[PDB]
Every structure is written in structure tokens, then in C-alpha cells.
Amino acid sequence: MIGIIWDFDGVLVFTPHEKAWKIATEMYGATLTHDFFVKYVSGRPRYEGAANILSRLGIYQKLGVKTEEEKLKLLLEFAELKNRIVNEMFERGEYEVNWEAIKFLLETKEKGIKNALASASKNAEKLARKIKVNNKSLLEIFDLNVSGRAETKEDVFKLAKEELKLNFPEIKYFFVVEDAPSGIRAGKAIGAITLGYERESSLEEADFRFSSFGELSVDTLLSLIGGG
Ligand SMILES: [Mg+2]
């Protein structure tokens, strides 16, 4: 049978990604453009993004931060500030639910497909618990949740895969629903068929590229295996 491993943010839920960085950058005296975000921050590791902002928008220079230890002190402050802002804007309800993803999720569930929630975020489970689908939480629709139990996509995907197999040994095919280029790579690394949801980035490395759910069928999956 089939197992599907779901990333959360960017797939089942949309949060403002650029916005957290913009606000941190604003409070250090600079303006983050969309152009800059796309070129030096988006899709890169958090600390690389942060260091790009601090150096190229002149914030190091402005504050007299000259040595590597001084730079490093501010880098880690800045990157922590950005996480703290992601947390606060989650606390303020700043997200939208992707009901069309939940649609496909429910469709796979009725055809006997097993579904794991597999986010690296500490907040995925909480949000999933509070979003309602019929007479339960979106969380309880999943057969399995491993969210926040590791801190990279590949480690959480790996964990979700091992647990899906333990619980259901007769699963033979794994899919990863993913919205980010790094996740597509993480999916391939654990031997899953990657379902690339392009809402913003293009995901050329993905086995199946799509722009909206419902453009997915259970039959698409079988077809993907396929030869797969
Ligand atoms: Mg994602």
C-alpha cells in the first residue's frame, strides 16, 4: 500500500515567510526588498540569509560591528530575533489554511492510504490540533505525526518513514508532499516520490510538479508508480 509524508507550512497552511525577515530587518534600520529576499535569503539556510542581510544592507557597517566575533554575536542575535518574530506572528494567527490540500488528504484517506504529518516546526502540531475538519482536528486526520521531533526536513521525513513502516509493514511506496526545493531534495534522499507543490518556487527536481491540489488524484499516485 501507499504512505504519504506531508510537510506542513507551505503545503497545508500558508504563513508569511518574507514578512518575519522584513520586520527583523526593519528593526535593525534597513529595508528588505522582495528582490533582495529572492536573491539572498529565500530558500537558503536561516543563518546564511541572516548574514546576507547584515552584511549587504549595511547593518554591520552602520553599528560598528567589525571583527568576526562581533559579527557573530550580532548574527546569532538577529537570527534568533527572526525566530522570535515567526513565533509571535503564529501567536497572532497569521496564517491561512489550504483547504484544497486537506481535500486531497481526505481523498487519500478514504482509499486506504496512510498519511504522516512531518514538519520540522515546533508549532505544526499545535496549529494542526486547532484547525477543524468536520468533527475533529486536522491533526487527528493523520495516521501519524512526528512534527518537531527533529530539526531538518530530511530527519523528520526519515522519522516519518520509519514510523509509517513500523505501524504498517505492508507499505511499499512513499510520497512526500513538499513546497520547498530543499524539501524536494530531502524527499529524494529518503527514497520517496516527491510531489512538488509550486505555489511560489518552481521545484524542477520534483518527480511530479503541480500548482493546485485537486490537480492530484489518487489515480495520479498509482500512475506515478508508474514507472516510478
Ligand atoms: Mg513545505
mmCIF file of N, CA and C in Angstrom, residues 22 113 125 172 191:
data_model
loop_
_atom_site.group_PDB
_atom_site.id
_atom_site.type_symbol
_atom_site.label_atom_id
_atom_site.label_comp_id
_atom_site.label_asym_id
_atom_site.label_seq_id
_atom_site.Cartn_x
_atom_site.Cartn_y
_atom_site.Cartn_z
ATOM 1 N N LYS A 22 11.437 40.706 7.132
ATOM 2 C CA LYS A 22 11.293 42.131 6.840
ATOM 3 C C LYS A 22 11.263 42.899 8.145
ATOM 4 N N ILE A 113 -5.008 5.023 2.028
ATOM 5 C CA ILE A 113 -3.622 5.484 2.027
ATOM 6 C C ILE A 113 -3.270 6.007 3.423
ATOM 7 N N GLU A 125 2.148 20.917 15.060
ATOM 8 C CA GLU A 125 1.204 20.072 15.783
ATOM 9 C C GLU A 125 0.132 20.910 16.477
ATOM 10 N N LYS A 172 4.735 0.030 0.764
ATOM 11 C CA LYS A 172 5.871 -0.206 -0.129
ATOM 12 C C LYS A 172 6.254 1.065 -0.868
ATOM 13 N N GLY A 191 14.323 8.365 -0.327
ATOM 14 C CA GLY A 191 13.739 7.415 -1.263
ATOM 15 C C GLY A 191 12.231 7.518 -1.427
#
